[model samples]
Target: EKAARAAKELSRESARAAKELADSNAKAAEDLMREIARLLELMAEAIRELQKQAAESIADSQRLVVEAIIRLAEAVKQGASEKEIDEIVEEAKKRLEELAERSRQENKKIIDRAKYEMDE
Candidate 1:
């Protein structure tokens, strides 16, 4: 009968459509997975860059601290007043502490941002 034939055709068409939809969904999932991988790679690179900057900053701070210490030592060698030497040392210590605190804050910010992005 024509009705039976038409019904069979409709069923086949429905199955074809379902298959196509499934394929599309699979492709979309693959694409999303690739995007996530790329984002993770980018996050890793950003972390590395942050770490490199932090390391350089630490090195510079150490050099500056040493220079400050040397200056203080020279002043002492030149028979500077005790009060002057103490003042120089105290200033150096304060500056060093400030640098350390700043570095800690910067590192925390970088880590937090990275985590937030990765979660997103």
Candidate 2:
């Protein structure tokens, strides 16, 4: 009878251990799921931010080029020399290149920051 009681006690302890392990596994899975959901949200926000900044930069460059073209027209109307007109065209292209490079750097920084946040 004593041996039987000891066996029963052992079985009870084993059952408790199994339940605890199951509970712990369930909790870990739930926490990981929550974190992944939040990470997705962060990624979505980052993408939108990237798009917004990209759109703004694109719009600004469009306006800048339009203004440059108008100035080119004005110069032509005033009978500016061909060489001077060429210079003005070159300058406009250089400025547009600079703007594009700047925008690229800014977008890269935004992506890096988002990655840092996700790591945290």
Candidate 3:
């Protein structure tokens, strides 16, 4: 009887430990997700600010390349040379490369450090 009671107590303790660890890990993931969301917001904000013209013409807001598009519209506005407008496109592409690389690396770090409790 004592052995059975002790075994039950040990099993309960293990389960409680696993639950607490799972909750802590879950909270950590939420924190990381919140930060990731903000990072993505900043990237979108940068693309939005780069060229208002590009953003305005987006029929598909989901896929953004308006920074490049607005620069193309420079041919219509007639203030900047085509070369200057094209330069904007080039700059956008260059920044996009860095943003994508940085975002991927950051995401990888989060996944690499993620921890989980094994199932009983």
Candidate 4:
């Protein structure tokens, strides 16, 4: 799934962004990280609501994935090391798996539709 792929990419991108900003502007890094994580949660929620099963009954995995994404961002934003930027990346890295994994195995048509909608 793209999320599984995106998770890895996001980790690399976040690490790169965190390192770059930490070197240049730490304030900017925080905002960027927040946006990334927030965007992920929004994307997950978008996918969840679009599914017929979700309308009938909530999926625990989906909820966990969303919650994990939310906490992951908060963790990075609030508790990240003010010193080593790697720790900042590591903080967020830990939580990507659950989100990416759950998002991986789903109705591809719905996911494709969500992805298409997101692109707009």
Best by TM-score: 2
- Over 90-111, each residue of candidate 1 has an lDDT whose tens digit, in order, gives 6765665666567656655655
Score candidate 3 by lDDT. 0.41
> Mind giving the per-residue lDDT tens digits that candidate 3 earns over 1-120?
222343344334434433443444455455545555345544344333323322222222213244344445544466565566556655655554454445334433433343221100
Candidate 3, after superposition: displacement of residue 100 in Å? 0.9
Position 12, candidate 1: lDDT = 45
User: How much lDDT does each candidate structure score?
Assistant: 0.55, 0.60, 0.41, 0.43
- Model 2, global lDDT: 0.60
Question: Per-residue lDDT of 41-117 in model 4, one digit per residue for the tens?
Answer: 65666444544433322344344445544544565557654343344334445544443334334433444555555
Worst 10 residues of 4 by lDDT: 20-29
Best by lDDT: 2
**Steric overlap count per candidate:** 0, 0, 0, 0
Q: Rank all candidate structures by their TM-score, best first, as comma-separated numbers.
A: 2, 1, 3, 4
Which portions of model 1 show Cα errors greater than 4 Å? 1-39
Clashing pairs in 3: none
By TM-score, how accurate is candidate 1? 0.60
